Amino acid sequence: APADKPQVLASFTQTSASSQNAWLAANRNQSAWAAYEFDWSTDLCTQAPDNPFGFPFNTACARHDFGYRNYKAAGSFDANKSRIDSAFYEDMKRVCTGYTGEKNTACNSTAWTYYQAVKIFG
Ligand SMILES: [Ca+2]
Numbered sequence: 001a002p003a004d005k006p007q008v009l010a011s012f013t014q015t016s017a018s019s020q021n022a023w024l025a026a027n028r029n030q031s032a033w034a035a036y037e038f039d040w041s042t043d044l045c046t047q048a049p050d051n052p053f054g055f056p057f058n059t060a061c062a063r064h065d066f067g068y069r070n071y072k073a074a075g076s077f078d079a080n081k082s083r084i085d086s087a088f089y090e091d092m093k094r095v096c097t098g099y100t101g102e103k104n105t106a107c108n109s110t111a112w113t114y115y116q117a118v119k120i121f122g
Pocket of ligand 1: 061
């Protein structure tokens with residue numbers, strides 16, 4: 001792989017919206033990154049806690065699978081896990097931003113439950 005693979009990988013897995021956005025752009029043009037042989041697979045939020053209200057967390061789960069699967073393959077999962085989990089939480093809270101009033105609170109509560117689950121059983 002290219003010598004700057006670690007820096008690219010780090011750039012796609014920060015907690016900021018610009019990092020999420022850089023990953024989204026790459027995810028939609030996977031072909032441009034073939035030289036890097038990233039694992040782009042995801043099972044979305046499979047095996048996550050219940051989401052009775054249906055908050056749309058699939059894209060957050062996808063970027064979280066990207067950090068886990070690619071850092072595991074790089075042999076540096078333990079050192080980067082807590083960042084990937086936090087970026088997951090930040091991604092979910094950006095979803096919750098689109099709801100206001102009571103619904104915002106319900107969204108944040110579901111996001112915290114998702115965050116806690118990967119922090120403890122991830
Ligand atoms: Ca997943």
